[PDB]
Amino acid sequence: FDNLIGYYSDDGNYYCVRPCVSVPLSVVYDKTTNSHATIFGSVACEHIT
Amino acid sequence: DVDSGPPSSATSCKEADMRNSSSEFFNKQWPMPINASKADGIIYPTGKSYSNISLTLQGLFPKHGDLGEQYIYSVGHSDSN
Ligand SMILES: *[C@@H]1O[C@H](CO)[C@@H](O[C@@H]2O[C@H](CO)[C@@H](O)[C@H](O)[C@H]2NC(C)=O)[C@H](O)[C@H]1NC(C)=O
Ligand SMILES: *[C@@H]1O[C@H](CO)[C@@H](O[C@@H]2O[C@H](CO)[C@@H](O)[C@H](O)[C@H]2NC(C)=O)[C@H](O)[C@H]1NC(C)=O
Numbered sequence A: 001f002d003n004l005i006g007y008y009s010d011d012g013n014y015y016c017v018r019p020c021v022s023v024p025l026s027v028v029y030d031k032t033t034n035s036h037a038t039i040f041g042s043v044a045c046e047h048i049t
Numbered sequence B: 001d002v003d004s005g006p007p008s009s010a011t012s013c014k015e016a017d018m019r020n021s022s023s024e025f026f027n028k029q030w031p032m033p034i035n036a037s038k039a040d041g042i043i044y045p046t047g048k049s050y051s052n053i054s055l056t057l058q059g060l061f062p063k064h065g066d067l068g069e070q071y072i073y074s075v076g077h078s079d080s081n
């Protein structure tokens, strides 16, 4: 698709170029108790902290 | 402009033995056609590189099975002894 994938830098290391990504969001909501929680889909907590 | 160096001081040129393409001296035909399965005569893209993909590119490529034109460079006449 003519997008940048790799780059041969001047230091001698090949690198992989990936687009900048954002974590998915899901919100579970309860109307009766008025309480909510968030879900970070398919990502561990060590990436959240 | 750019200086090309000194001109040639030789006032005499050298005689060449001209033979046409059907002079029984240059009609030895080794075909060597273009084979796309070996990627014969493929010019790489100028400022990009690709890895482990197959791509349909539009550009300037030779035809498959093209025999082309064969040119032979010979050695001039010289004395046996
Ligand atoms: C061989 O050819 C080169 C280029 O045709 C000559 O280099 C040029 O030399 C002249 C002086 O005679 C300079 O003014 C040019 O700038 C040179 N050009 C380049 C590209 O180098 C070279 O002199 C020739 N050598 C001999 C022995 O004939
Ligand atoms: C180059 O590409 C081929 C095909 O796209 C890759 O082969 C695949 O490898 C995975 C992982 O082993 C397999 O699950 C697939 O079945 C393979 N597909 C085919 C068609 O063989 C290959 O791994 C790639 N090589 C590199 C170094 O990235």
Ligand SMILES: *[C@@H]1O[C@H](CO)[C@@H](O)[C@H](O)[C@H]1NC(C)=O
Residues within 6 Å of the ligand: B035, B036, B037, B038
């Ligand atoms: C072109 O190359 C492939 C693989 O090297 C070979 O199998 C095929 O015979 C070649 N084509 C011809 C016309 O010889």
